[PDB]
Paper text:
While a ferrous ion is present in the [name] [name] structure, it is not the case in KDO1 [name] as the metal is lost during the purification from the KDO1 preparation used to grow the crystals. In all four molecules of each of the [name] structures, an iron ion is present in the active site chelated by two His (176 and 312) and one Glu (178). In [name] the pocket is characterized by a neck defined by four residues, namely, Trp112, Arg145, Asn232 and Asp230. Of these, Arg145 is instrumental in the recognition of L-lysine, as it is able to attract the substrate towards the end of the pocket where it can be maintained during the reaction.
We have focused our work on the iron(II)/α-KetoAcid-dependent Oxygenases (αKAOs), a mechanistically diverse superfamily of enzymes that use dioxygen as the oxidant to catalyze several reactions via C-H bond activation, mostly hydroxylation. These enzymes operate with three substrates, dioxygen, α-ketoglutarate (α-KG) and a primary substrate. One of these, KDO1, catalyzes the formation of (3S)-3-hydroxy-L-lysine, while five others, KDO2 to KDO6, promote the formation of (4R)-4-hydroxy-L-lysine. We based our analysis on the structures that we solved by X-ray crystallography of two of the regiodivergent αKAOs active towards L-lysine, namely KDO1 from Catenulispora acidiphila, that catalyzes the C-3 hydroxylation, and [name], from [name], that catalyzes the C-4 hydroxylation.
Residue numbers in the entry: 17 to 230, 241 to 372
The structure:
């Protein structure tokens, strides 16, 4: 049988009963542990994940965790994982620093269980908001509108795997949409959409590429299995950056790759409130189209709306492997700065 090349993510329609289970489990964990960063909760995370998640989610995520086959896209859309009460959530804060984690506590529990069922362990990075906790609120900040960050809006966020500049980048990501009233499409790009290993892709296994953090060590864009590889890629940071410092050969290879890759980008899915996108950060890159925060256009008219709000959680399947880059007193806190180099604070 000829290979069925994946061009889009797996879509799971979460049922009302599953949504009810998740809500009650979220509430129980809040009462039992206070918050999702409780060391007793984190230490018994996988036990809580397999015992408390709706069983179909547990089966999906378990299958996904160990699936690096030719058929695997590397992303799952869980449609309507949660019901967001928009009025209780109230207005979106001016930036991520104004997020009410007391209100997002239950969501943090739900997201950590999803990672826990992979199985994978939520982690935080000093490279991202000086850690900023296991759960990040991704909000369009008017001051950062034209930036190539999660606090951006007016500009296209070109496809990238999270933290391509780190040797210990996240294994898994979850993006929980609380609101997307601007109807911003989610953009995904899978290395598996290319199909069979070709000459353009083979050049990416060479450890000759700059992975700029946002004289420098170089890394491979493709790694892992030679036939069915893993990817570390950031189009904006490695290609569309004058200060990337790529060699003539490396830039050519990346340009050739980008030409082939850009035709495979999937921007079909527009997330709704309560959808969660779950990603294997070694298989699938993500991005977001340009938008004006707090508005959408319908019939050539501007409809004012509440500003985009999404929750991001990152995880690693092994605490052992990352142990030389984590805090002595916190094996879930990654202190890596750039491709092996650790942040030198004092
Ligand atoms: Fe990202």
């Amino acid at each position: 049988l000829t290979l069925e090349i994946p061009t889009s993510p797996l879509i799971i329609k979460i049922t009302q009963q599953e949504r009810n289970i998740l809500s009650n489990v979220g509430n129980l964990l809040v009462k039992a542990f206070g918050n999702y960063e409780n060391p007793d909760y984190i230490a018994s995370l996988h036990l809580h994940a397999f015992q408390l998640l709706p069983e179909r989610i547990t089966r999906i995520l378990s299958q996904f965790g160990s699936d690096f086959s030719a058929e695997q896209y590397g992303a799952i859309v869980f449609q309507g994982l949660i019901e967001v009460d928009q009025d209780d959530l109230g207005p979106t804060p001016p930036n991520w620093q104004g997020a009410d984690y007391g209100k997002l506590n239950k969501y943090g529990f739900i997201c950590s269980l999803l990672h826990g069922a992979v199985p994978s362990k939520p982690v935080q990075y000093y490279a991202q908001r000086k850690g900023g906790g296991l759960l990040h609120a991704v909000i369009p900040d008017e001051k950062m509108a034209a930036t190539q960050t999660g606090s951006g809006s007016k500009t296209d966020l070109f496809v990238h795997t999270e933290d391509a500049f780190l040797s210990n980048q996240a294994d898994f990501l979850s993006f929980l949409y609380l609101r997307n009233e601007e109807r911003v499409p989610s953009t995904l790009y899978s290395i598996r959409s290319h199909g069979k290993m070709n000459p353009v892709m083979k050049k990416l296994f060479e450890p000759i590429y700059q992975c700029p953090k946002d004289s420098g060590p170089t890394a491979s864009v493709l790694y892992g299995n030679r036939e069915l590889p893993f990817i570390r890629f950031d189009a904006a940071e490695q290609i569309f950056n004058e200060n990337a410092g790529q060699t003539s050969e490396a830039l050519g290879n990346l340009m050739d790759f980008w030409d082939e890759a850009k035709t495979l980008i999937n921007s079909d899915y527009i997330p709704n409130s309560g959808d969660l996108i779950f990603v294997n950060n070694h298989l699938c890159a993500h991005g977001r189209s340009a938008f004006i925060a707090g508005q959408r256009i319908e019939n050539g008219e501007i409809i004012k709306c509440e500003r985009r709000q999404m929750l991001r959680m990152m995880s690693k399947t092994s605490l052992i492997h990352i142990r030389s880059v984590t805090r002595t007193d916190d094996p879930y806190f990654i202190m890596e700065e750039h491709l092996g180099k650790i942040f030198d604070l004092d």
